Each structure stands twice: as structure tokens, then as C-alpha cells.
Amino acid sequence: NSGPISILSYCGSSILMTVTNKFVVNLKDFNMNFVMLFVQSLVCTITLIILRILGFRSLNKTDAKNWFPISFLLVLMIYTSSKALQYLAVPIYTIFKNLTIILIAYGEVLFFGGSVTSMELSSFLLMVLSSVVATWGDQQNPGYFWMFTNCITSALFVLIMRKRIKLTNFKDFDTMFYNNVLALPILLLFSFCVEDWSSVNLTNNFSNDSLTAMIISGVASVGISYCSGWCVRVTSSTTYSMVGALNKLPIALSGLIFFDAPRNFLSILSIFIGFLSGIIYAVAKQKKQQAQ
Amino acid sequence: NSGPISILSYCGSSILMTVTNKFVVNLKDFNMNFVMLFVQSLVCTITLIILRILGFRSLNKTDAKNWFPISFLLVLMIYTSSKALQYLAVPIYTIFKNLTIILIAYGEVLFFGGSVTSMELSSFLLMVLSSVVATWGDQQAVASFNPGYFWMFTNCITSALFVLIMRKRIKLTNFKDFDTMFYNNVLALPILLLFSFCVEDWSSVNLTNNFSNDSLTAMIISGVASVGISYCSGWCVRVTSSTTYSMVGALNKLPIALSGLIFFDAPRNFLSILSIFIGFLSGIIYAVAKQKKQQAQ
Numbered sequence: 001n002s003g004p005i006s007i008l009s010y011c012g013s014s015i016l017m018t019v020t021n022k023f024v025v026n027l028k029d030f031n032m033n034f035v036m037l038f039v040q041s042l043v044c045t046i047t048l049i050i051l052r053i054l055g056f057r058s059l060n061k062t063d064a065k066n067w068f069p070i071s072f073l074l075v076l077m078i079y080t081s082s083k084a085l086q087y088l089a090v091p092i093y094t095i096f097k098n099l100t101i102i103l104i105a106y107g108e109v110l111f112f113g114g115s116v117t118s119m120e121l122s123s124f125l126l127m128v129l130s131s132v133v134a135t136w137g138d139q140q141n142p143g144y145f146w147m148f149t150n151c152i153t154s155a156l157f158v159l160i161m162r163k164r165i166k167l168t169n170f171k172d173f174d175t176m177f178y179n180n181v182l183a184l185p186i187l188l189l190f191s192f193c194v195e196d197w198s199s200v201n202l203t204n205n206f207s208n209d210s211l212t213a214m215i216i217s218g219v220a221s222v223g224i225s226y227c228s229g230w231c232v233r234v235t236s237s238t239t240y241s242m243v244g245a246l247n248k249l250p251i252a253l254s255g256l257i258f259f260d261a262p263r264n265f266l267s268i269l270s271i272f273i274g275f276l277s278g279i280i281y282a283v284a285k286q287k288k289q290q291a292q
Numbered sequence: 293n294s295g296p297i298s299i300l301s302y303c304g305s306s307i308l309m310t311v312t313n314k315f316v317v318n319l320k321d322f323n324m325n326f327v328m329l330f331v332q333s334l335v336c337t338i339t340l341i342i343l344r345i346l347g348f349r350s351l352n353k354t355d356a357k358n359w360f361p362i363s364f365l366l367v368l369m370i371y372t373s374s375k376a377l378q379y380l381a382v383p384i385y386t387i388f389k390n391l392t393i394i395l396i397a398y399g400e401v402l403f404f405g406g407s408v409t410s411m412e413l414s415s416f417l418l419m420v421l422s423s424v425v426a427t428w429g430d431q432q433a434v435a436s437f438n439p440g441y442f443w444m445f446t447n448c449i450t451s452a453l454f455v456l457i458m459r460k461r462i463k464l465t466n467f468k469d470f471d472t473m474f475y476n477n478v479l480a481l482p483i484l485l486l487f488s489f490c491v492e493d494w495s496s497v498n499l500t501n502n503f504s505n506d507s508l509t510a511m512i513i514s515g516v517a518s519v520g521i522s523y524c525s526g527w528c529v530r531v532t533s534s535t536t537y538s539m540v541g542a543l544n545k546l547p548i549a550l551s552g553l554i555f556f557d558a559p560r561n562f563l564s565i566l567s568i569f570i571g572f573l574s575g576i577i578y579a580v581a582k583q584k585k586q587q588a589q
């Protein structure tokens with residue numbers, strides 16, 4: 001586990017999680033989003049514990065209270081992100097979620113000090129265009145405030161995890177385990193603070209059937225769980241933040257091939273612009289090694 | 293005459309020419325652009341000879357047939373723009389004309405061999421955003437769409453083939469300013485009358501009534517201001533870089549657009565403003581890029 005294998009790994013799970021959540025679990029637009037994530041991180045936790053007794057990990061209290069900010073950034077990342085999409089459109093959220101990419105690249109400079117290649121700067125802007133270009137080819141204040149929060153919480157999150165990982169020599173699995181376990185409590189705070197619970201009404205909603213999807217989702221979410229922390233650790237907090245935005249293209253590109261859906265050339269340019277953005281960013285990484 | 297002083301000259305001239313064509317001569321959208329522009333190239337021609345005898349330039353036959361493409365490239369650059377602008381909105385025309393900056397920067401690779409700094413690449417992409425961002429912040433048979441984009445594809449290359457070749461033949465023929473100004477004005481004058489019959493419709497019973505003593509007087513007014521840009525356009529490309537002239541020219545319209553928000557109580561859009569300040573960022577990156585290029589060697 002090192003090198004570009006991280007990125008190919010992150011794809012299959014984000015590819016698996018996108019398909020599986022839309023093919024395996026049809027209409028996963030549940031009443032309580034955090035509960036699905038609570039299981040996705042809980043089914044992930046159980047899966048690891050089964051693996052410890054068949055051979056991976058460790059348990060501390062010194063590292064423990066230093067990771068809680070990361071998890072708290074995660075759930076807040078979702079709460080802010082979840083709240084952004086309530087008042088915001090999907091394409092524009094990508095634009096700001098793509099604008100977050102830049103600061104994350106320059107946020108790594110404040111945690112590790114590296115320089116942002118002028119070529120890397122070009123790639124991110126192309127995603128911005130590919131983001132805007134796609135946005136300009138579609139239709140549909142409260143939102144922007146939460147997106148201003150998602151941009152920062154998603155940044156401080158992916159940044160800090162990468163910090164504490166290399167600080168506590170957290171090998172993979174270790175990253176996965178702590179993020180799954182420590183998020184479990186915080187989700188119950190936001191699950192109780194945000195969702196509506198009613199034993200008269202919702203106790204019937206997520207019945208014996210629905211949980212099958214939430215656990216099915218968790219098993220598929222196992223991939224993304226392990227690979228996210230593996231990507232940030234080996235490569236860069238920028239690399240993980242970039243691949244996440246790039247993934248939706250082959251998924252979006254798959255949506256145009258595998259589907260007879262009304263399209264627009266503007267939408268296509270965005271996807272191919274995003275594809276270009278990777279090539280520049282892919283080559284940009286090359287110029288860092290060769291130059292130095 | 294050298295260095296960034298060129299840019300202010302090309303800027304001030306493009307700015308003075310913008311006002312003079314829009315405030316002093318309102319409805320500068322004439323029925324026959326080539327004749328209006330033919331005068332602008334004639335007053336420059338007339339203007340130059342008076343200075344030729346008051347002190348700058350030269351006339352050849354070896355230079356002549358190597359310069360004819362520029363005037364033809366120059367006038368053709370306009371005809372494509374005029375015909376492109378018929379089917380396209382002002383902001384969208386801006387986007388592609390800013391995309392030519394990329395090829396022009398990379399067209400220089402085919403003409404002189406310099407490298408396009410990744411930092412330079414950043415600016416050009418940003419210019420796209422300030423252009424793209426503004427377009428998304430605006431209002432306005434398929435076979436009617438495409439005719440514009442088609443005419444724009446030619447303007448983009450002729451706009452490239454134009455400023456590119458001139459800068460080469462300029463540095464090849466040591467064309468000092470005026471020479472750049474003179475030759476493009478002189479050799480273009482005939483082509484302008486060429487396009488005058490090729491495009492315009494003439495009717496002395498009807499069109500003779502259009503260009504009256506007011507409008508006819510105006511056609512000279514615009515040329516008087518265009519003396520700057522004419523001398524400064526070729527001055528800009530020569531001293532700095534064929535990219536710089538293609539960049540500063542695109543940069544100029546920001547402060548004029550910024551004037552529209554300040555000097556005017558006009559409905560605005562934050563997107564429009566973001567675009568403009570995005571453009572300023574575009575310059576600063578390009579300014580540093582030029583700064584990092586000269587510093588390196």
C-alpha cells in the first residue's frame with residue numbers, strides 16, 4: 001500500500017459506492033442521513049474488529065483525544081455539506097467544492113510547507129471551468145453561508161487527518177478505525193440535534209427492510225472508508241481532495257454512454273475539461289519530482 | 293520607447309478611442325465599417341506624411357509583398373469579427389477572443405521557441421474565468437448558432453496569424469514604430485475598399501443620405517483617436533511580446549467595464565464584478581510571469 005495504488009483504490013470504492021448506492025440500494029434518500037452514515041461507519045467498525053482477530057490496529061487514549069477534532073470536523077463536514085445541498089444546487093456545490101481544492105492545496109503549505117506548482121494551479125482552475133462550464137449548462141444567500149462552512153470544514157478535516165496521521169505514524173486501517181469509531185458518538189449528537197425522531201411515526205419508517213440497505217451501504221462503504229485515509233496519507237491531502245472531484249466525471253461520463261439521456265455540449269466540455277485537469281495535475285506531480 | 297510604457301500607451305489609446313467612439317461620436321455603429329475604418333487608416337496615412345516632413349518611416353517593394361498578408365490578415369481579422377458579432381453576444385465573443393491568448397502564447401512556440409511558463413498558463417485560464425464568469429452573469433435554428441462560432445473560429449486564428457506574423461516581420465525587418473503604423477495603414481487602405489464593394493451595398497439615392505456632414509465629419513473624428521492605438525498596437529507587439537499585446541488588449545476592457553459600475557447607476561451582478569476582479573488577478577499573475585521570465589535569463 002503506497003504510490004498511485006491509493007488513487008485506483010479510492011476510485012473503485014467511490015465508483016462502487018456511487019453505483020451500489022444507486023443500483024443496489026434504490027431510493028436511498030432516507031429520512032435520517034446521519035443514521036445511514038452511523039451504520040456505514042459502524043458496519044465499517046465491526047468489519048475491522050473481525051479482522052484484528054484474524055492475522056492490524058491499536059487502541060489508545062493519548063491519540064484518542066487528539067483525533068476527536070478530526071471526527072468532529074467530519075460530521076460537521078457532512079452537516080455543513082448536507083445543509084449546503086438543502087439550499088444549493090448540485091453543480092454549483094461542485095464549483096465551491098472545487099474552489100475548496102485550491103485552499104486545500106495552499107493549506108498543505110501551512111502544515112507541511114510545500115510550494116504549489118504553477119502547473120498545479122492551472123489544473124485546479126480547469127476543474128473550476130469544468131465545474132463552471134458544466135454549471136453553465138444546466139438549470140436547477142442561505143446556501144452560500146453553509147457552503148462557506150463546508151469549504152472550510154472539508155479543508156480543515158482532510159488537512160488535520162493528514163497531520164495527525166503522519167504525526168502519530170497512523171498506518172492504514174488505523175486511520176480507518178479511529179474515523180469510524182469516534183464518529184459514532186458525534187453522529188448521535190447531530191442525529192438527535194438535526195433529524196426528527198418520533199417513535200409514533202419513524203419507528204415504522206426504517207423498518208426491518210430499510211436497515212438492509214443501510215448495512216448493505218456500510219459494506220460497500222468499507223472500501224471508501226479504508227482508501228480515503230490511505231490516499232491522504234501516502235500521497236497528499238490535495239491528491240485525495242482532487243481525485244474526489246475527478247471521480248464524478250467517469251461516473252458522469254458513464255451516465256452519458258450507458259444512458260440515453262438528454263445532454264448538452266456544454267455539459268460535455270465540463271467533463272472533458274475535468275479530464276484535462278487531471279492530465280495537467282498528473283503531469284504537474286511529475287514536474288515536482290524531476291525539478292527537485 | 294521601450295518596456296512597459298508601451299502597455300499604458302496601448303491602454304490609454306484603446307481607452308481614448310473607446311470614449312471618443314462612444315461619447316463624442318454617438319452611434320459609431322455605421323452602415324459601412326470598412327469606409328469608416330478606411331478613413332481611420334487614411335487619416336493615419338495623411339497624419340504620418342506630415343510628420344515624415346516634420347522632424348520617421350519608409351516605403352519599399354521588398355517590404356510590400358511581405359506585409360500585404362498583415363493588412364489582409366488585419367482587415368480579415370475585422371471582417372470575421374464584424375460577421376462573428378452578428379450572431380454572437382458581446383460576452384461570448386470575449387470568451388473565445390481570450391482563448392486565442394492561449395494559442396497565441398503557444399503560437400509563439402512555433403515562431404520563436406520560448407517556453408510558455410506554467411504561471412503564464414495560469415493567467416490565461418483566469419482570463420477565461422473572468423470572461424466565462426461574466427458570460428454566466430448575463431442574458432444575451434442551430435444552423436444560425438454555428439455561423440457565428442464558425443466566423444469566430446476564423447477570427448481567432450486570423451487574430452493569431454495577424455499579431456503573430458507582424459511581430460516576426462517586425463523583428464525581421466527592424467520595423468520601428470510608424471513603420472508598423474504606416475505599413476498596416478497604407479497597404480490596408482486598398483483591401484478596405486476591396487471589402488467595401490465585397491460586403492456593403494451601395495445606393496447613392498439612399499445611402500448617400502446616411503453619411504451626411506455630421507456623420508462624415510465623425511468618420512474623421514474616430515481616426516484622430518485611433519492614431520494612438522494604431523501607433524501603439526504595433527508598438528506594443530514589437531517591444532514586449534505578441535502575447536503581451538494580445539493580453540493587455542484583453543485587459544483594457546476591465547477598467548472600462550469597471551467604469552460602467554462606478555460612473556453609472558447601472559444594474560449590476562456580483563458575478564460581473566467577480567469576473568472583473570478575476571481579470572485583475574489575471575494581470576497580476578501575468579505581470580509576475582513576465583517578471584519571472586525576464587528574471588530567469
Ligand SMILES: Nc1nc2c(ncn2[C@@H]2O[C@H](COP(=O)(O)OP(=O)(O)O[C@H]3O[C@H](CO)[C@@H](O)[C@H](O)[C@@H]3O)[C@@H](O)[C@H]2O)c(=O)[nH]1
Pocket residue numbers: 014017041044094097176179180221224225226228229244245246247248
Ligand atoms: N476517512 C474517511 N472518509 C470517509 C468515510 N466514510 C466516508 N468518507 C468520505 O466522505 C466523503 C463523502 O462520501 P461520498 O458520498 O462518497 O462523496 P464523493 O463521492 O467524494 O463526492 C463528493 O463530490 C461530488 C462531486 O465531485 C459530489 O457530487 C458529492 O455530492 C460529494 O460532495 C467521501 O470523500 C468519502 O471518501 C470514513 O469512514 N473515513
Ligand SMILES: CCCCCCCC/C=C\CCCCCCCC(=O)OC[C@H](O)CO
Pocket residue numbers: 099102116117118121411414566
Ligand atoms: C460567490 C463567489 C465567492 C467568491 C468566489 C471567488 C473565486 C476565486 C477564484 C480563484 C481564486 C484563485 C486564487 C489564487 C491565489 C494565488 C496566490 C499565490 O500565492 O499564488 C502563488 C502561485 O504559485 C502563483 O502561481
Ligand SMILES: CCCCCCCC/C=C\CCCCCCCC(=O)OC[C@H](O)CO
Pocket residue numbers: 129133269273283287387394420424
Ligand atoms: C467555454 C469554453 C471553456 C473551455 C476552455 C478549454 C481550454 C482548452 C484549451 C487549451 C489547453 C491548453 C493546455 C495545453 C497543455 C499544456 C501542456 C504543458 O505545459 O506541458 C509541459 C510538459 O510538461 C512538457 O514540458
